[PDB]
Design a protein around this ligand. Structure first.
Ligand SMILES: Nc1ccn([C@@H]2O[C@H](COP(=O)(O)O)[C@@H](O)[C@H]2O)c(=O)n1
Ligand SMILES: Nc1ccn([C@@H]2O[C@H](COP(=O)(O)O)[C@@H](O)[C@H]2O)c(=O)n1
Ligand SMILES: Nc1ccn([C@@H]2O[C@H](COP(=O)(O)O)[C@@H](O)[C@H]2O)c(=O)n1
Ligand SMILES: Nc1ccn([C@@H]2O[C@H](COP(=O)(O)O)[C@@H](O)[C@H]2O)c(=O)n1
Lengths: 258, 258, 258, 258
């Protein structure tokens, strides 16, 4: 199958749907569910969460599924086996706390050349790919060959996500969202582009751009027009903030955070 | 073979023996040996002990076997790979301290969907299945297809086991037994029933109820009447309290408790 | 092949050599090299050392081999995977510090029933088999079927080894040798005999006794008279004390002792 | 293929090139890149770095490759699984920090007899083979059969490398280079020679000497004259000091040093 990999940049709201492939899987990450409409449908092949709020995102995802807001086959933690990026015990006990999820690194590390590329840039130059690029790597390891990108906009003029992230619960869990620039300073356009180009060339897969007005389109060729249809389903009374587990839950998980 | 899984609720003493299957294995757990009569015979396929008193139960079981009070093929520790439920070193060194026993989780974790079901409810909602339900999961992983339940009564009106648990040694090892309600507050009827229903539906096995007067019978269909016979053998001068290992034994095991 | 397993009791010096099998391997343990004559030849199939002085015994063995006093194919550490019996890091890094040796437990644990037998008696009853019995278990795991025993005398009237153990270096490394009873209080005749009987019956091997005047002969049938010959080669200017590694060597090994 | 293994002794500059084999791979180690000319070409099959400065050497190597000063297929850390020789966490997380490199011990330990030989001499006698000998062992494990040695001179009259090692960055990272004798006191000619002889005899490979005026030639037969040609390419504006990673990089790696 073809895969659609979606960041949460503004271009998530400016997909050119006439270019949407006929039969695809969808990869979403992080606060994707803050979206005000189902820009890519409610069915996900995989959802990816950073290690830092994985405990609360997993909880929240279960509520989303129970609520029939989204479905997903795979749940991925976007880890790297780096002490500075993730809690060591969290990773060691992962499959025992989250038996229906995966460590994304199980797949990422299958791309040796890209693992090496990432680590060198991260460790020595503080140049860190974003989640969207990480999902691409995992897609490639899973055997996907045609990758359609959207919602990747390189944090222009602030973090500027495709939705309002200033929500009480997320702000309390992750105070970095209080300010306009909440993402890692080590991210950049060039870093993401160079990484994507490395992946395409190294693993001989194909990248397409679904959003013609995104800066991404200056670097990645457009998905072909197919005259596809898409009705964007609206959302109302939806989950638009992360949920906070009880203090008893935190206590049971306390060896696995910080 | 068919398996009979026995909790230690009052219904252990009100089995409808005309419904006992012809050829079965028996699973017992915890203080099963406190029973005043051999309500299910002295031959067990497996005995299951919680991690918390495993050290003393193993010792006690060896005495029971040496004494010809019970026989058993398998000895299981009912663990979950959760730091809040069990001592980490205990689990790591288990097969070296108890070479003829098993960690039950070796089998429980083979039921991925149920492992995930359990962990989510336990961690986030403090809803904990009971040992009887854990034995069912292990039975399923071992390949059993027809499961006959008894002694499961959901702790109605106190812990109310089928025997007197207020015994000197057990009270000293586990002071929680001093009070009428000694079991985990996180247990409940709904939690056990929902879990059992999940297992039956997910793994396409069959559950039966051996005790028509138990509340369990409101939820699980009765084992068919077969006109089976059973003479309940009495017990006298039997082991009705847990045994306490020497202080030298505790010293050797001290890295594996608390 | 048949194997001769030798403790270091007084009966080591009263082997009835007319009963020595025609083609055998020899297992020796601990301070075997303190012997004043080659009671079993200088060629060993295996030598076994307790964990406690393994570091110095390995060093000493290399000197014995370099000196052409003994040869051996296998070097075994007689471990049990018990924190109270052996240093944990020592066991974890063993093959990296001693690449041509083995942990005996790699073989001992292949005898599940006997592993369980040992652990239960050791942990709960403080009944500890001796090295001679441990070598028997390892012999069985290695596939030996006929086991000829000597030098097993149950520490009658003191530790009373077949040689003088009051040597400067051994006394400094292991002050317990200063007193007449230097062995573990948890050893006994009954414990060794019961264990040997368990092994013979459980693994359907054959035990023989090479020393007709040893108390062992009250329990184990005599090796058949074959009219075999044996000239006991004398030893002179031989290594009769353990060697002590340099303080630099101890420093490098310091994580692996105590 | 045949392999050329190069230490960084003065004889690196006195190779008899008429003896250079026709088709070979090249192994270099440590500060090899300090060389003022390409005494063995810019193409390496493998480069080996000691654990102590591996973090900075890896960084530096990437710059050398980016700069087209050298190429290499394999990057090896010359480790031994010894706490006194290398940082434990460094070794445990190695493949996650350096995904395109190898722990040399993965290969060294495949030579059991030599692993045992090394450990015994190192631990008990403080007799430590040099990197050149370590590369030979790894070459043998990789399947090389004909080994041509150069740049091995046993540190005569000081460490006396084939280049100036008194460089600001190396001196700051490794103050031992400030003095004329900066190498391990535990190295010696006899130790290296005995080890090389052990390897040749044990693994039935062939050693040759490329440098007729080196003391090595008193012990190892000369590579046959083949009338081979070689033009030594000069180096200018080359990297002649190790590079120092940023303080942010050190912070991310801080669990893996000291
Ligand atoms: N303005 C934005 C916001 C998010 N994104 C991308 O969306 C993905 C998910 O966002 P976060 O990793 O910050 O949660 C990342 O690739 C991020 O870089 C973007 O490209 N431009
Ligand atoms: N009154 C009781 C007592 C025990 N039981 C069940 O018997 C099994 C063994 O009891 P404990 O896990 O508390 O040792 C559990 O399933 C427990 O819930 C019950 O269902 N009702
Ligand atoms: N008097 C003795 C001395 C040693 N032995 C046996 O010789 C073997 C080696 O002695 P030690 O394990 O104490 O080093 C053991 O089986 C020990 O019990 C014996 O049986 N009688
Ligand atoms: N004067 C020298 C310098 C280095 N060498 C060898 O070059 C190799 C690399 O040097 P170092 O391991 O010290 O970095 C080692 O084998 C070292 O012994 C040598 O033989 N004589």
């Amino acid at each position: 199958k073809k895969v659609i990999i979606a960041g949460n940049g503004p271009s998530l709201k400016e997909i050119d749907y006439s270019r949407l492939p006929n039969d695809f899987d969808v990869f979403r990450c992080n606060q994707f569910y803050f979206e005000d409409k189902y820009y890519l449908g409610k069915k996900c092949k995989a959802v990816f969460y950073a290690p830092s709020l994985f405990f609360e995102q997993y909880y929240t995802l279960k509520h989303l599924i129970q609520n029939q807001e989204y479905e997903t086959e795979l749940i991925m933690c976007s880890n790297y086996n780096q002490a500075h990026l993730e809690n060591e015990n969290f990773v060691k006990t992962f499959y025992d706390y989250f038996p229906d999820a995966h460590l994304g690194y199980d797949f990422f590390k299958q791309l040796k050349d890209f693992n090496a590329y990432f680590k060198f840039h991260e460790i020595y130059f503080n140049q860190r790919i974003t989640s969207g690029v990480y999902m691409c790597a995992v897609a490639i390891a899973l055997g996907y060959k045609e990758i359609y990108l959207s919602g990747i906009d390189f944090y222009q003029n602030g973090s500027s996500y495709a939705f309002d992230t200033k929500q009480k619960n997320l702000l309390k869990l992750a105070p970095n969202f209080k300010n306009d620039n909440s993402h890692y300073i080590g991210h950049s356009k060039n870093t993401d582009i160079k990484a994507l180009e490395f992946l395409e060339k190294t693993y001989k897969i194909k990248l397409y751009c679904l959003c013609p007005n995104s800066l991404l389109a200056n670097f990645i060729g457009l998905a072909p027009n197919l005259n596809s249809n898409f009705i964007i389903q609206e959302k109302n009374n939806y989950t638009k903030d992360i949920l906070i587990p009880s203090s008893e839950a935190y206590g049971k998980f306390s060896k696995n955070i910080n």
